[PDB]
Ligand binder design. Structure first.
Ligand code: K36
Ligand code: K36
Lengths: 298, 299
């Protein structure tokens, strides 16, 4: 029992994290095969077609790359979306089996938070409705990657670029595509809102029942709210339309609590509560994917 | 900016995690040098003096150990407090620089939660006043270790043994000493409740101020002496100094006494506005975990 934010083990990622320094810009890259990927603002702060011109005019010898104190010489440079791809003269002999994948809204993945080309800390994030994260990043952490680990190998899903006002973090996939409607420029940007993820909240409320925290359904006469009714309510109250997940078949069977009881709970609990904590909290938590809860309950 | 539960990188620990199976009992161990440590209940469910005799009567060949699917033959065995130390036929050539150290109350450390000798996920815990953790463990996860990564190398501080009432967890240090007043026996054990850690709450409120959330200090400061008297009757620990607070107070312009007054105001919860997303004081962040996440904040 117990419910925690589960990070994936980082050994395969650590063997790929490098520093990349150009001028006064210090950030991190990802070394796979014979190349390093890093955010294109390693070049400086540009917009639009200025990135291509900054690429043409840069010199490979001006990019200083280290892996654990060993220099990697840059022998080619190219832009890949919002990333620079720097070919280097040495193959990473510890390149893991890997794929590049896109995170889906509501998914968790793990951040290998790095400074000076060394991973300093790992943590879980959740991809929000507007393609942002609530992470923990300071100057020097750009190029930190987000990843998952499966039976097949590592999946790299994210590389960090920027912090929007309100501590809203933004980045790209490893093909250099930004995850939401923001760009890597220090100008004000209007971005769609981030409604609470109802699906994830249902997973967390099941987690609570698994852990004998069930006052919000076991006390008071049973209530249910239909999906249709819940969706119409949710659209006016800053929650996402409900989406089903196969985990809920397992959870509902094991707990005896239906999905419709959980939707009615969300509506009742949506302004918070003070009766008793739910998994330590007095507000609904949308940060856990159904996968993360299943891995800790069954 | 932002505040998250920060786990230490796991590469060094992963190269030490093994499965240990004895009969129907499946758990994990820690392979360092030419030995593996694992919980003694790999032997069965014994009590008190029976463990010594159960270890003496076991055969080395009845312990099956795998590292990443590779067999490690047990060639010796010894009881070390709550652990078995199983000598094996191969030295771990990836043994990191390490020490065994005791976590202190309020400390964070990272858990490498393992099943079948494979780390499935990591998370952070906080050593509570009564020597328990709020972790996440299922059957098969015993022998998972807690660790920190420091300048010197890895510090192994915890090995997992059991789940107590209330979804709380207990275990030992790597000398086999249990962290609180409990043992590895499946009988009801009464353990003293754990007050909220005031020191860590102070660190978390500083974290909020670093992140431009400071409504709760915006006078009436409270002295450490008055705070300690109030805390002793309200389920909070006495304040304890931590040298991170010299940095936090200077950077934020907010004194510890302001923060202690805030703890008293906020002790029953609030609903004015969130603090770092929360409506109750959070004691799960050590001052070291906050410092690591704020040291580069300019604003
Ligand atoms: C890269 O290391 C850094 C990460 C930031 C630093 C603070 N917290 C982060 O996540 N990224 C930047 O500094 C980034 C560089 C630009 C050229 C994209 N700029 C930034 O994040 O400034 C904050 C900001 C971004 C967009 C509009 C208004 C303010
Ligand atoms: C060892 O893997 C296991 C870890 C427990 C399993 C459930 N959650 C844990 O943390 N330890 C035990 O099973 C332990 C064995 C004794 C001989 C020490 N007994 C125990 O923890 O009893 C409580 C319990 C609660 C829920 C399921 C199984 C056991």
């Amino acid at each position: 029992a117990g419910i925690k934010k589960m990070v994936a083990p980082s050994s395969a990622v650590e063997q790929c994290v490098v520093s990349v320094v150009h001028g006064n810009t210090q950030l991190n890259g990802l070394w796979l095969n014979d190349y390093v990927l890093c955010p294109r603002h390693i070049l400086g702060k540009y917009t639009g077609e200025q990135w291509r011109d900054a690429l043409i005019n840069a010199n490979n010898f001006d990019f200083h790359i280290l892996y654990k104190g060993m220099e990697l010489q840059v022998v080619g440079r190219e832009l890949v979306g919002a990333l620079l791809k720097l070919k280097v003269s040495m193959v990473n002999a510890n390149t893991p089996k890997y794929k590049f994948a896109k995170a889906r809204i509501g998914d968790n993945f793990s951040i290998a938070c790095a400074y000076n080309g060394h991973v300093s800390g790992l943590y879980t994030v959740t991809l929000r409705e507007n393609g942002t994260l609530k992470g923990s990043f300071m100057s020097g952490s750009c190029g930190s990657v987000g990843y998952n680990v499966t039976n097949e190998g590592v999946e790299f899903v994210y590389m960090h670029h920027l912090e929007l006002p309100g501590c809203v973090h933004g980045g790209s996939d490893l093909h250099g595509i930004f995850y939401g409607g923001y760009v890597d420029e220090e100008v004000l940007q209007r971005i769609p809102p981030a409604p609470a993820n109802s699906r994830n909240i249902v997973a967390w409320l099941y987690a609570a029942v698994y852990n004998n925290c069930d006052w919000f359904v076991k006390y008071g006469p049973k209530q249910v709210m239909s999906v249709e009714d819940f969706n119409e309510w949710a659209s006016g109250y800053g929650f996402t339309k409900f989406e089903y997940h196969l985990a809920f078949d397992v959870f509902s069977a094991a707990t005896g609590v239906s999905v419709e009881q959980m939707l009615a709970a969300i509506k009742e609990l949506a302004d918070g509560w003070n009766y008793a904590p739910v998994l330590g909290s007095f507000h609904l938590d949308d940060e856990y994917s159904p996968e993360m809860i299943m891995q800790q309950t069954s």
